[PDB]
Design a protein around this ligand. Structure first.
Ligand SMILES: O=C(O)CNC(=O)C(=O)O
Ligand SMILES: [Mg+2]
Ligand code: NI
Ligand SMILES: [Zn+2]
Length: 331
């Protein structure tokens, strides 16, 4: 069995290997990459996403979100307070302001220590889930707006034609902006490209051990767990690496830098934070191997999770027994 310790693997495809996306995901899995829940892919030196990032300042962040924490430094939740619209140029100036800018630090490990010590005492503002793309239309390799759609994959594997679309999303981050512990909708894959700016640190639990994380989370967030049997789908809970180690939870960590892709695998729980002003693009995707994970994905039906239009068909076809309860949580 490849990668039995579930380490995060890093890949360096050649320009030829970068042509066929599906084939390279299957190759990474042949080497055991999915066992980690997360892999890094460094593009060949010949590749670029677009020519420059000099002309992005007029993109609008319609609903910036202030991430307000509650709890203790290593075990906390966050809620998202809506703020007034602002452009990417305005957001970049805000991220660089004395109130929000990255502090002086020695290296990534020092900054990680500072994050976990001090995150809860600040409320950073995040631009999230902005439909759009920064890939040039002429970039033919690993262009996250030109991937095969999840609806087409389901139709190819299972024969059922369904409604829905699958488009990318942009993220604009600052120091201490935080992504809570979660798996993807319907335990899909994700891919994330860091277009520009400062790094993103990731934490991940191997898919084979995800239920260990879920059990700790029920212990640590006992009111939330009573409220909903899949409350991690709410995407509000944080647990630090120190707390995970104290509780024996298997996990790994890695820092993504600008120009690098990350792939998350089905049922790989992940969380992380941004180092300073940055912009990422991400989308969900599927392969044949996903279908069995989609069929078994937990679901939130309490009302909190609310998700895209295109999840309806996935639940309807893959999880007909759960569909009526889930749709009620949508309504
Ligand atoms: O960068 C982010 O805020 C979130 N990214 C992910 O959870 C992802 O691509 O799956
Ligand atoms: Mg612009
Ligand atoms: Ni994710
Ligand atoms: Zn719920």
């Amino acid at each position: 069995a490849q990668n039995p310790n579930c380490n995060i693997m890093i890949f360096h495809p050649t320009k030829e290997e970068f042509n066929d996306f599906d084939k390279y995901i299957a190759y990474m899995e042949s080497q055991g990459a999915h066992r980690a829940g997360l892999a890094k892919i460094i593009p060949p030196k010949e590749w670029k996403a677009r020519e420059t990032y000099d002309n992005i300042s007029e993109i609008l962040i319609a609903t910036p979100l202030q991430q307000v924490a509650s709890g203790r430094a290593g075990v906390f939740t966050q809620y998202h307070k809506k703020k007034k619209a602002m452009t990417v140029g305005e957001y970049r100036h805000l991220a660089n302001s004395k109130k929000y800018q990255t502090p002086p630090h020695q290296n990534f490990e020092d900054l990680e220590r500072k994050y976990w010590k001090n995150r809860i005492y600040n409320s950073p503002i995040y631009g999230a889930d902005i439909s759009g793309s920064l890939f040039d239309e002429n970039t033919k390799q690993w262009n996250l707006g030109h991937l095969g759609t999840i609806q087409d994959l389901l139709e190819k594997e299972c024969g059922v034609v369904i409604e829905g679309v699958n488009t990318p999303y942009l993220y604009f981050g600052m120091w201490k902006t935080t992504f809570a512990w979660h798996t993807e909708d319907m335990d899909l894959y994700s891919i994330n490209y860091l277009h520009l700016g400062e790094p993103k640190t990731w934490y991940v639990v191997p898919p084979e051990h995800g239920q260990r994380l879920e059990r700790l989370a029920r212990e640590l967030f006992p009111g939330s767990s009573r409220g909903c049997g899949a409350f991690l789908r709410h995407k509000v809970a944080l647990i630090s690496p120190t707390v995970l180690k104290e509780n024996g939870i298997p996990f790994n960590r890695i820092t993504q830098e600008a120009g690098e892709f990350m792939v998350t695998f089905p049922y790989g729980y992940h969380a992380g934070f941004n180092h300073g002003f940055n912009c990422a693009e991400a989308i969900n995707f599927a392969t044949p191997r996903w279908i069995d994970y989609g069929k078994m994905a937990s679901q939130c039906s309490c009302g909190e999770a609310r998700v895209t239009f295109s999840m309806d068909a996935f639940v309807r076809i893959l999880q007909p027994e759960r569909y009526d309860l889930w749709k009620r949580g949508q309504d």
